Amino acid sequence: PVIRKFTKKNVARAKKKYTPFSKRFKSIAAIPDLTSLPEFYGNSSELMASRFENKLKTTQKHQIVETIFSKVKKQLNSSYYLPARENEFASIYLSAYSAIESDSATTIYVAGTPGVGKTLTVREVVKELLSSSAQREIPDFLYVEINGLKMVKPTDCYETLWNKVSGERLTWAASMESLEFYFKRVPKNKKKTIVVLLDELDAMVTKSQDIMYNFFNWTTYENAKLIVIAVANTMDLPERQLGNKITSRIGFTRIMFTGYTHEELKNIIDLRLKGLNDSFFYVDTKTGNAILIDVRKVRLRMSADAIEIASRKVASVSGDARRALKVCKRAAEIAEKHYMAKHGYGYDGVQTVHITHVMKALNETLNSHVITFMTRLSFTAKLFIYALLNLMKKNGSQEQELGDIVDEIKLLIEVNGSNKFVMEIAKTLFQQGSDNISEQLRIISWDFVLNQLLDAGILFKQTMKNDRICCVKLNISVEEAKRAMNEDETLRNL
Amino acid sequence: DPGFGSLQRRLLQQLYGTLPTDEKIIFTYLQDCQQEIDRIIKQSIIQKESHSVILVGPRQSYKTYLLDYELSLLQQSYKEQFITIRLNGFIHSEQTAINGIATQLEQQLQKIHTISSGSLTEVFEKILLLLDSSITKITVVFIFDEIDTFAGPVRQTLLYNLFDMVEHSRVPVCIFGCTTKLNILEYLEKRVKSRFSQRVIYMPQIQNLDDMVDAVRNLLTVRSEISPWVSQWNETLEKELSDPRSNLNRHIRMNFETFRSLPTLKNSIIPLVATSKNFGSLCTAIKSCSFLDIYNKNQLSNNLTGRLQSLSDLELAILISAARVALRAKDGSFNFNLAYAEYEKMIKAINSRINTIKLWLKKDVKNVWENLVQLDFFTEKSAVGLRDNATAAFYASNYQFQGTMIPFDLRSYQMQIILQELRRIIPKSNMYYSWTQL
Amino acid sequence: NVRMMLRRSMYKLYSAADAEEHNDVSYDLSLVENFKRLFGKDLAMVFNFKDVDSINFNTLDNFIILLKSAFKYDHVKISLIFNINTNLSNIEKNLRQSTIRLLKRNYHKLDVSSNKGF
Amino acid sequence: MNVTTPEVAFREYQTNCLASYISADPDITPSNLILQGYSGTGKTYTLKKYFNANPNLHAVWLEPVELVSWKPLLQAIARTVQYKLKTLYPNIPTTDYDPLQVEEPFLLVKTLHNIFVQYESLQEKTCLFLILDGFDSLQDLDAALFNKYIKLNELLPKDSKINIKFIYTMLETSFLQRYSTHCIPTVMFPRYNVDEVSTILVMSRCGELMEDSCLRKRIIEEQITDCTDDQFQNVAANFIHLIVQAFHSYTGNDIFALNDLIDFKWP
Numbered sequence A: 001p002v003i004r005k006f007t008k009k010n011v012a013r014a015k016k017k018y019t020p021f022s023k024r025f026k027s028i029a030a031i032p033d034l035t036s037l038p039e040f041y042g043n044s045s046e047l048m049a050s051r052f053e054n055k056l057k058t059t060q061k062h063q064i065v066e067t068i069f070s071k072v073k074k075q076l077n078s079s080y081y082l083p084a085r086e087n088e089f090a091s092i093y094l095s096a097y098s099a100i101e102s103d104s105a106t107t108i109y110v111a112g113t114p115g116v117g118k119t120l121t122v123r124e125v126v127k128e129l130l131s132s133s134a135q136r137e138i139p140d141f142l143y144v145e146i147n148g149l150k151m152v153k154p155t156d157c158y159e160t161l162w163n164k165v166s167g168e169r170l171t172w173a174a175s176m177e178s179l180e181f182y183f184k185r186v187p188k189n190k191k192k193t194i195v196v197l198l199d200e201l202d203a204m205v206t207k208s209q210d211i212m213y214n215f216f217n218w219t220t221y222e223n224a225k226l227i228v229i230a231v232a233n234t235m236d237l238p239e240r241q242l243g244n245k246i247t248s249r250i251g252f253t254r255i256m257f258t259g260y261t262h263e264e265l266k267n268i269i270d271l272r273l274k275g276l277n278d279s280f281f282y283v284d285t286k287t288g289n290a291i292l293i294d295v296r297k298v299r300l301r302m303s304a305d306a307i308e309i310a311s312r313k314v315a316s317v318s319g320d321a322r323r324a325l326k327v328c329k330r331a332a333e334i335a336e337k338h339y340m341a342k343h344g345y346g347y348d349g350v351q352t353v354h355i356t357h358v359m360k361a362l363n364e365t366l367n368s369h370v371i372t373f374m375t376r377l378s379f380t381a382k383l384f385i386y387a388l389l390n391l392m393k394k395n396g397s398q399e400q401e402l403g404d405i406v407d408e409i410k411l412l413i414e415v416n417g418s419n420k421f422v423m424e425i426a427k428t429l430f431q432q433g434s435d436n437i438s439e440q441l442r443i444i445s446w447d448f449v450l451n452q453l454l455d456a457g458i459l460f461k462q463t464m465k466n467d468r469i470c471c472v473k474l475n476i477s478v479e480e481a482k483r484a485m486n487e488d489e490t491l492r493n494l
Numbered sequence B: 001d002p003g004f005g006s007l008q009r010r011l012l013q014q015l016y017g018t019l020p021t022d023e024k025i026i027f028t029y030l031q032d033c034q035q036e037i038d039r040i041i042k043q044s045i046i047q048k049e050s051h052s053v054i055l056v057g058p059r060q061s062y063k064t065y066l067l068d069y070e071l072s073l074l075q076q077s078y079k080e081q082f083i084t085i086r087l088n089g090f091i092h093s094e095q096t097a098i099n100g101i102a103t104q105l106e107q108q109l110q111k112i113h114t115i116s117s118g119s120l121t122e123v124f125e126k127i128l129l130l131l132d133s134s135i136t137k138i139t140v141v142f143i144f145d146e147i148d149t150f151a152g153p154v155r156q157t158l159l160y161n162l163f164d165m166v167e168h169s170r171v172p173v174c175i176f177g178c179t180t181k182l183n184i185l186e187y188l189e190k191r192v193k194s195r196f197s198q199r200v201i202y203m204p205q206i207q208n209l210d211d212m213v214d215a216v217r218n219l220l221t222v223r224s225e226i227s228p229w230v231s232q233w234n235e236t237l238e239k240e241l242s243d244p245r246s247n248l249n250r251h252i253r254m255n256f257e258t259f260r261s262l263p264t265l266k267n268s269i270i271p272l273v274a275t276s277k278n279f280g281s282l283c284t285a286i287k288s289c290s291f292l293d294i295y296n297k298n299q300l301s302n303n304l305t306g307r308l309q310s311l312s313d314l315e316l317a318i319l320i321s322a323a324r325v326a327l328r329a330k331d332g333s334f335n336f337n338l339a340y341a342e343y344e345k346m347i348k349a350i351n352s353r354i355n356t357i358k359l360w361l362k363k364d365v366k367n368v369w370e371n372l373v374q375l376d377f378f379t380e381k382s383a384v385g386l387r388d389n390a391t392a393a394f395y396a397s398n399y400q401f402q403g404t405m406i407p408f409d410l411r412s413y414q415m416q417i418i419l420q421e422l423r424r425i426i427p428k429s430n431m432y433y434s435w436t437q438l
Numbered sequence C: 001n002v003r004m005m006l007r008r009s010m011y012k013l014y015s016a017a018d019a020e021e022h023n024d025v026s027y028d029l030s031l032v033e034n035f036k037r038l039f040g041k042d043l044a045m046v047f048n049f050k051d052v053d054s055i056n057f058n059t060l061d062n063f064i065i066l067l068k069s070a071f072k073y074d075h076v077k078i079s080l081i082f083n084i085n086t087n088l089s090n091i092e093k094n095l096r097q098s099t100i101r102l103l104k105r106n107y108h109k110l111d112v113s114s115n116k117g118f
Numbered sequence D: 001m002n003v004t005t006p007e008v009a010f011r012e013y014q015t016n017c018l019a020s021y022i023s024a025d026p027d028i029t030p031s032n033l034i035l036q037g038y039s040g041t042g043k044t045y046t047l048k049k050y051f052n053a054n055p056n057l058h059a060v061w062l063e064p065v066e067l068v069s070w071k072p073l074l075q076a077i078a079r080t081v082q083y084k085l086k087t088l089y090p091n092i093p094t095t096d097y098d099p100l101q102v103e104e105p106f107l108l109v110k111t112l113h114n115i116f117v118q119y120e121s122l123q124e125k126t127c128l129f130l131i132l133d134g135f136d137s138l139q140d141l142d143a144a145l146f147n148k149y150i151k152l153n154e155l156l157p158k159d160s161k162i163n164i165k166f167i168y169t170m171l172e173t174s175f176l177q178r179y180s181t182h183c184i185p186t187v188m189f190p191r192y193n194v195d196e197v198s199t200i201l202v203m204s205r206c207g208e209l210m211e212d213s214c215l216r217k218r219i220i221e222e223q224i225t226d227c228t229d230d231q232f233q234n235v236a237a238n239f240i241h242l243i244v245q246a247f248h249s250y251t252g253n254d255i256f257a258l259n260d261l262i263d264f265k266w267p
């Protein structure tokens, strides 16, 4: 045969066809009704879940103990009635209902900051629309959800949509022409409205505006019945991508989701804990199992001051809801740990949570752990930091040479040769305590402390093979290093 | 006697840590981290609750050790209720991670009682359908290593999916990350950080000397009658860790003030106990600790000052001349011709002052110059060393630097040892000593 | 580079051997090690550098040092031809010293020019 | 423990440390080991002598200088492991995996696991030593390759009957100091004195020099030489000492340069 110049022995290719849709049913007048086909619109395909489920199952439960705080922790996750988001719900629902009722196409753009709750309210709107359609008030439709961060290649959207509307399996380009023909030329008497939910839109338009332009433009055609809802972080993202005139031609609806306040967040937290708060529980003393209404009758309380202070702190900085929920959950977890530790329980009066637990859980996310890290470092590393600070206090250049640091360390050692500690540390620092080792040039354990400081994210060193003129710089500002040095004793004194 | 051999083998396998999990020993200064990690893992596995956590600490700070201990402890009472998947940030790119996850999932699921077949997108969608979605589920426990390489500034797509799996799923999931950066929370982007559980635990550090003493005592104490000598050895060590003037205490204090790391001391101790042939030899070696001095001396036998004492006369003279020439220059640069001119001037001065010292020719000094540049005494004018990653090296390997086109006599080198260090190191009896200062 | 020259040399060697013989391997020096098992005969490789005055001598020196590693196989015989244009003084002054000592083990200098004695 | 220490001329402590570190028991042995020393310092000689003194230990020898990248290194590892494991146990049925399928570090781990699965019928756990002799001589080298080979020993199975242990031999110190935080055991080979070089050079090129044909021709062209062997050895030793005393200041403590000059100036 032939001699290959290189080989690819780990190539895997999926079985997908190439011929687009506008070659199948011949003339346009020969297209049958697509509503009644058993493969179109997912009419009969409801067995994909059973293909891979029942694999992660096992048969054993050794009477898992459920402490009192377990219920509170379980009922406070980010998965388990919208209290604040009502205007956006009304606007989106009205737009979508008007679009569905009159058999038209439309585009809704939602922009916001993380944790506001845009996906939740969009899904709630979709559920309400599905219920209304099942009530036989508007023509039935299909709901397709497409995410942006859950795809390997960015151009995998097209085929997915096609695979959710036809049952075929084509490549991305052929899917693009198939979708174009389907949305343009198929008559409106043989289709069904589709509600796409393009999500994390900013992750698709990163090399070109092709996907966004196509998806937004497919709503312009008269024969199409598409209703696109796209959510994103930045508000004026399409303008920065497509252009003013194209956007003006398209004419979509725009909605902005502002952050939360310290009242709405507290309302959310209080709503998520209604039945549990101020209730009664039967608790077994031997094990610790708790049952909602020998054994004891106890109560669970959560101080409103703790909720208020947590909401006030969280809403001040970001406006999230996930972080507030997680803070409350962590406070409950700390209280549960203390309770089990005190009562000597294990895995398999009025118990409350005070403001102290919430404050302790809140301080863990704001404080930094650099000062504590340096107040426990070795003597040589602290000497290195001290020499660097001294050189910076003279040159004021923020980027020092390494040989200068070595010379400064040597001068500092040789000029204070009258203090007891540095008098008796010199031999262990230069000859490691033995009389058979010649006097070293740099220090004992130079590279070790250098790499220990450089790995932790405290120093920055440029790459040069000459190890005497390499430049290093700090990365934690200067006041923190000054505090860390001042907390010492032998370095403070000299 | 076989008893001494058994004792030596037991000591060696105690030091390396290879020991049955039911009799392992854990240092007293990090038991709180053990209890915290054990509580997290027990909550995740026994009670079927999802968790995400990150461990931050310096290299060799007992991160993987504690996780392995916890998993081995839990893999003898509840073995049918969890599976483990480990990923390493150094040998797993953003594409091979999916294949590795699929393969390990398939293997573990088959062992407990396809997925890995197809293109990348098919595998990704299959694992997403599997995970993202009496009788209880099975917890998948992820173990990341060097998670800071998956949190770059470009995509961050795997962490988003995994944290979403932790947040919204019906299959309980527990994920542990490991990294050494102190500001890992600032590497994550907005959405990934929002989905994070905001739980970071910092590894403990040694604060006193009694902690190191207790760690050494725990390391070197046999607590099981297996040999006739175990009665005496356990006593002898107690006489060297109680006396504050013993050599072992001095070495421990030196390590505390210089390195402050148990693994270095462990590596130092291993050959000391593996070298002795008789029990008396072991006792006298642990009494005197004279082998640690030899070990330390060898460990410093190829540093900058260890090579300077293995040079011939001509090489030393050339080095001194080059340093003298480099001291006068503005930026420290020099080349071959100036160094040889200074060398010949110095030789002529030495000869005229006073047997005569031979003046080697240019072609014989060329070999000495190449030998010196090989031993890493000079470097080129402005040359970077080894690139950080592979792509940078590939880019640099396709460009012809100007240093390889200039002839030999005009390459501009730079010094790595200044003249003051030569003056400090070289003994005063050498006949070149007077020329080491201007 | 050096690796690319090695790959070209190995590809040419494998192509010539397969053509003369009437699977796939790795284009490394390891192909020299396994030549006897794969084919059966012994190599007599002959290199030929063209216009040696236009090659950065660092790469050439590295390649010669790399080729030095094939002497422990007992069935290979390497030869080299240098098409020098000006003179060998530049070759002496540009290469390292150990490589010159290695080359000086045995060599022959031939003056080949059109105008040799008219 | 249960190992034999060979006798090397001027490498006593290095031999003692080598016998202390590596052994036949996977329970007591380090996963990684570095030997450092500049050119012509006597490390491959010592390691080869140590393995030749103990025939029970298994070893695979590589030279990552002929291989000039990382992909060829992975493929060479995946091929030599199979070859050595097949030639050692011949009664275990096994399949064959193509080495060329290994193109990424993860695929190497998968292939090695698949290879090691088959040999699970053995009696007791053994250890296979992989010697990457010359890791610092790769042509296109960066500061990230070593970080993969250090951690490659954690993704392999933990209870298999075949355990793999690495051994590197590194030249420079600037490269080695980059990985000083990992705390990997090391044995360093310092350079030689002048007396040691002279004695080593005599011990090596004394016997071989006399069976040369030139001196035989020169003595058959000359008269008888009684006490032939001792006088011949004395002549050779005197020549070696003269050449060392003449060119030590020019060749340095380099065994190779003197070993070339001796051959140059003999005829």
Ligand SMILES: Nc1ncnc2c1ncn2[C@@H]1O[C@H](COP(=O)(O)OP(=O)(O)OP(O)(O)=S)[C@@H](O)[C@H]1O
Pocket (backbone or CB within 6 Å): A077, A078, A079, A081, A082, A083, A084, A085, A112, A113, A114, A115, A116, A117, A118, A119, A120, A121, A268, A321, A322, B191, B194
């Ligand atoms: N009005 C609300 N009532 C109850 N829970 C809410 C409300 N708003 C937000 N949440 C919480 O917010 C959590 C996160 O979901 P979302 O806020 O919809 O996420 P998101 O807005 O898509 O965030 P991204 O993806 O980072 S832009 C939900 O699981 C809820 O617990």
Ligand SMILES: Nc1ncnc2c1ncn2[C@@H]1O[C@H](COP(=O)(O)OP(=O)(O)OP(O)(O)=S)[C@@H](O)[C@H]1O
Pocket (backbone or CB within 6 Å): B016, B017, B018, B057, B058, B059, B060, B061, B062, B063, B064, B065, B068, B178, B180, B263
């Ligand atoms: N499985 C194990 N059994 C016993 N000792 C171990 C084990 N793994 C590591 N060690 C040793 O425990 C000490 C520290 O553990 P390491 O795992 O090296 O720490 P680490 O902080 O995880 O290091 P990284 O992985 O480089 S961040 C060293 O002496 C290791 O050799």
Ligand SMILES: Nc1ncnc2c1ncn2[C@@H]1O[C@H](COP(=O)(O)OP(=O)(O)OP(O)(O)=S)[C@@H](O)[C@H]1O
Pocket (backbone or CB within 6 Å): D008, D009, D010, D011, D037, D038, D039, D040, D041, D042, D043, D044, D045, D200, D203, D204, D255
């Ligand atoms: N201790 C020794 N005793 C006797 N002969 C020795 C000794 N050390 C070196 N030699 C001899 O000198 C030669 C030097 O080559 P090696 O010691 O193999 O060099 P090396 O250290 O492997 O060099 P690199 O690092 O591979 S360039 C050996 O092959 C022996 O012939």
Ligand SMILES: [Mg+2]
Pocket (backbone or CB within 6 Å): A119
């Ligand atoms: Mg969302």
Ligand SMILES: [Mg+2]
Pocket (backbone or CB within 6 Å): B063, B064, B145, B178
């Ligand atoms: Mg680790």
Ligand SMILES: [Mg+2]
Pocket (backbone or CB within 6 Å): D043, D044
């Ligand atoms: Mg060698």
